[PDB]
C-alpha cells in the first residue's frame, strides 16, 4: 500500500534523473530509457484521487512532450528535444 509509488513521485524522480543523464552526462539513450516507461505507465490511467488530479493537470503536457521526443527520433533536431524539456520542466516546477 504505502510503498506503491504513484504518478507524481514517479515523474518527479524520473524527470530529475532523465535530466541529469541528458544535460549532465550527454546521454540521450539513457534519458530515453528513463522517460519511456514513465509515458507507458500513463496509458494504464489514474488509479487514485491523487493520480486523477495529476493526470488532469499534467497529462496533456506530458503527451505533448512525448510527441516532441518521437519527432526527435525521426528528425535528430535537438530543438525538438528542447521543446520536450520545456514541457517536462513546466510539469516538474509545478509538482515540485
Amino acid at each position: 500500500g504505502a510503498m506503491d509509488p504513484e504518478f507524481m513521485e514517479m515523474w518527479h524522480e524520473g524527470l530529475e534523473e532523465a535530466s541529469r543523464l541528458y544535460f549532465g552526462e550527454r546521454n540521450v539513450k539513457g534519458m530515453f530509457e528513463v522517460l519511456e516507461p514513465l509515458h507507458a505507465m500513463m496509458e494504464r490511467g489514474p488509479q487514485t484521487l491523487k493520480e486523477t488530479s495529476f493526470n488532469q493537470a499534467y497529462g496533456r503536457d506530458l503527451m505533448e512532450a512525448q510527441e516532441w521526443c518521437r519527432k526527435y527520433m525521426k528528425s535528430g533536431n535537438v530543438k525538438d528535444l528542447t521543446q520536450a524539456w520545456d514541457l517536462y520542466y513546466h510539469v516538474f516546477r509545478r509538482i515540485s
Partner: protein, 121 residues
Amino acid sequence: EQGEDITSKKDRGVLKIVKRVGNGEETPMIGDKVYVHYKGKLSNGKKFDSSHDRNEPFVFSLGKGQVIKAWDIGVATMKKGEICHLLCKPEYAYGSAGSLPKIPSNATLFFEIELLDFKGE
C-alpha cells in the same frame, strides 16, 4: 572584456555589469527559489536563448549547482528588480564539453539576467 570580477578566486571568470539597479538591501540566500528572466548570447553576440519563449519566469534553486557556476555566483549578488549582464568564461559555464549544438567547447557566454523575485523555498 568589460565588467567587475565577482569570482571568489578573482580570476576574471565572471564579470558583472549592473544595467538596472534593484530594490533590496537583500540578495538571495543559498537554497532560495529564484525567479528570473534572461537572455543568453555567445561572444559574437548571437542569441542562443531567451526565457520569454517559455512564457513565464525561469525558476531554479540558488547555490545547488542546478545551473552553471556563473549563474550561482552572479545571481547571489543581485537585488530584487536588478538587471545585470554577466560575462562567463568557460570554466564557469560549459567548459570543454560545451552545450551542443548551440554552445561550442570553450565558449565564453554572455547573459542578461533580471531578478524578479526570490523566496526561502
